[PDB]
Design a protein around this ligand. Structure first.
Ligand SMILES: *Cc1cc2c(nc3c(=O)[nH]c(=O)nc-3n2C[C@H](O)[C@H](O)[C@H](O)COP(=O)(O)OP(=O)(O)OC[C@H]2O[C@@H](n3cnc4c(N)ncnc43)[C@H](O)[C@@H]2O)c(*)c1C
Ligand SMILES: O=C1N[C@H](CO)[C@@H](O[C@@H]2O[C@H](CO)[C@@H](O)[C@H](O)[C@H]2O)[C@H](O)[C@H]1O
Ligand SMILES: O=C1N[C@H](CO)[C@@H](O[C@@H]2O[C@H](CO)[C@@H](O)[C@H](O)[C@H]2O)[C@H](O)[C@H]1O
Ligand SMILES: *[C@@H]1O[C@H](CO)[C@@H](O)[C@H](O)[C@H]1NC(C)=O
Ligand SMILES: [Cl-]
Ligand SMILES: [Cl-]
Ligand SMILES: [Cl-]
Ligand SMILES: [Cl-]
Ligand SMILES: [Zn+2]
Ligand SMILES: [Zn+2]
Ligand SMILES: [Zn+2]
Length: 473
């Protein structure tokens, strides 16, 4: 048909329904949420991306880029059927590395494990990003990107010093502090809104040689212990936690919470640094043996796979997820959170679920050294980044009634807070919110500026998806 002909006329490779490449490319990470693009352009160059955007304009189509395909909402498809999908995941190279500056230029289809492998093995370098090796660089970096080096070195987005971008009108432009700084600001936290990033330009650091993985089995057997433990962790996070300590509270055992973390330094330095928290934890915790690691080893250690260099998708999952970013969990919020934890969550046994309470902000958190005004990322004044995840087996249907489980847990916290105290993180995209509400919680104090920038760069909503920022002149 018309779109296939258009793409082929411009030399853009297209997927053919029924072939291996098509089946691979069209499969969402979240199989709860498949969409059917009108066509898939499997791009190899910037020029391909550009030509694909031209065809979209010619045929009046919406266009969506898919990088690693990890959108919890399948937004890489456009979050609905019938978009032109620009499939980026064969564009995987570290294009160049400058050893005077430590800056790398990277293609937009490189996955985190692959990015980390190439930068380590070829250049001895590292970037602070997420833990999942199959996550795409573009979705991740465009909206933040949090992991076990973030307390020490900041968000994935904070490594970004420039981009090459294909705009809605087909132009290719550079953005950085010194050129299209307004576009640059939007790309850094809300990047899916403003074009298709074709090259990431990224500051790196020397790959650390000395790292310690640590863990604490909390043994919170009841509401009271959990309430006291979460209070104690917030205290340590807000006022004490050194830069070198990166951690979260996680429960993957419906009642077996643990601290997991990464410390920049030796096991003995970790213990001394963490002791103030261990001293205030409810009694009964058990400190796990530490593991000594270098950089590449730490990448493998938190990956949940037997390798990290992914150039293909990871196995798919079938799930629903939600998020919160909070100034503080103290007060009725934690009370309500723990009530639900014990009276509802721990009795949910028909599928796997977890929460993670990530130490995102706090006095010594590198994430907080950037303010909300400085990039699109709006969560700089939030101490907690919280993930809620609800997963069924791939041979089951996610039940229509199951949504109320995560909805109720999140409501347990939000009902206790003024709206100004909390947001939501679009890297944990939750499609069950209308366009206005979603963008309000995803972008906080930066939404109004983002709406203007949207009117400037994508006034026809060419890159539309249901939780894109609205263009408002
Ligand atoms: C599946 C998965 C997700 C994880 C995991 N671990 C995370 C972690 O340790 N920290 C985090 O901060 N986040 C974690 N996430 C969530 C991911 O961060 C998000 O799901 C990312 O958005 C995934 O990025 P990507 O794989 O590239 O997702 P896509 O679905 O392809 O696109 C997302 C979004 O971005 C737009 N987009 C893609 N490509 C571009 C370009 N080049 N330019 C502009 N916009 C782009 C898409 O259109 C879509 O809107 C661990 C696991 C296992
Ligand atoms: O769905 C598809 N889409 C991809 C993207 O076009 C096709 O790949 C191409 O197939 C071409 C034709 O054989 C090869 O020359 C080229 O190297 C290869 O990338 C693949 O054969 C086809 O099944
Ligand atoms: O953002 C994220 N997203 C993914 C979800 O897509 C999480 O993966 C989970 O991490 C858990 C903790 O290791 C595992 O037990 C679980 O099986 C695995 O799916 C990962 O820990 C988290 O950082
Ligand atoms: C919770 O567990 C702790 C551990 O012993 C205990 O002190 C406490 O009595 C238990 N329950 C309550 C309601 O405190
Ligand atoms: Cl094929
Ligand atoms: Cl809409
Ligand atoms: Cl709309
Ligand atoms: Cl308007
Ligand atoms: Zn590789
Ligand atoms: Zn306290
Ligand atoms: Zn393997």
């Amino acid at each position: 048909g018309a779109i296939e002909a258009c793409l082929s006329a411009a030399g853009v490779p297209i997927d053919i329904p029924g072939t291996a490449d098509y089946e691979r490319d069209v499969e969402p990470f979240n199989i709860r949420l498949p969409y059917i693009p009108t066509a898939i352009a499997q791009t190899q160059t910037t020029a391909h991306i550009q030509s694909a955007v031209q065809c979209a304009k010619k045929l009046n189509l919406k266009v969506s880029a898919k990088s690693g395909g990890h959108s919890y909402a399948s937004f890489g498809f456009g979050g609905e059927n019938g978009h032109l999908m620009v499939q980026l995941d064969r564009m995987i190279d570290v294009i160049s590395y400058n050893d005077k500056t430590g800056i790398a230029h990277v293609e937009p289809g490189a996955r985190l494990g692959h990015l980390a492998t190439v930068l380590n093995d070829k250049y001895g370098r590292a970037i602070s990003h997420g833990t999942c090796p199959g996550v795409g660089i573009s979705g991740h970096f465009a909206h933040g990107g949090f992991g076990f080096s973030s307390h020490m070195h900041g968000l994935a987005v904070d490594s970004v010093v420039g981009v090459t971008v294909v705009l809605a009108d087909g132009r290719i432009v550079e953005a950085s502090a010194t050129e299209n700084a307004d576009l640059f600001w939007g790309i850094k936290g809300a990047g899916s809104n403003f074009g298709i990033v074709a090259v990431w330009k990224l500051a790196t650091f020397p790959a650390p040689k000395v790292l310690t993985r640590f863990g604490v089995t909390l043994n919170w057997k009841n509401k009271t212990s959990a309430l006291k433990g979460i209070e104690a962790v917030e205290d340590y996070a807000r006022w004490v936690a050194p830069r070198e300590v990166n951690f979260r509270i996680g429960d993957y055992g419906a009642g077996n919470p643990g601290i997991e973390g990464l410390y920049y330094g030796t096991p003995e330095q970790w213990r001394a640094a963490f002791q103030p928290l261990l001293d205030t934890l409810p009694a009964g915790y058990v400190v796990n043996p530490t593991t000594s690691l270098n950089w590449i080893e730490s990448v493998l250690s938190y990956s949940n796979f037997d390798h990290v260099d992914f150039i293909t998708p990871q196995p798919v999952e079938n799930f629903y997820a939600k998020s919160l970013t909070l100034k503080s969990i103290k007060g009725d919020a934690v009370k309500n959170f723990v009530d639900y934890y014990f009276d509802v969550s721990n009795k949910v046994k028909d599928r796997f679920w977890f929460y993670q309470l990530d130490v995102h902000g706090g006095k010594n958190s590198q994430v907080t050294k950037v303010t909300n005004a400085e990039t699109a990322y709006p969560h700089r004044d939030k101490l907690w980044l919280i993930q809620f995840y609800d997963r069924y087996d791939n041979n089951q249907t996610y039940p229509e009634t199951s949504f109320k489980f995560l909805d109720g847990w999140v409501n347990s916290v939000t009902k206790a807070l003024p709206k100004s105290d909390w947001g939501m993180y679009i890297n944990y995209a939750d499609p069950r919110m209308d366009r206005d509400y979603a963008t309000k919680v995803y972008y906080g104090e930066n939404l109004a500026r983002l709406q203007k920038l949207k009117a400037k760069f994508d006034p026809t909503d060419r890159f539309y998806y249901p939780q894109a920022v609205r263009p408002v002149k």
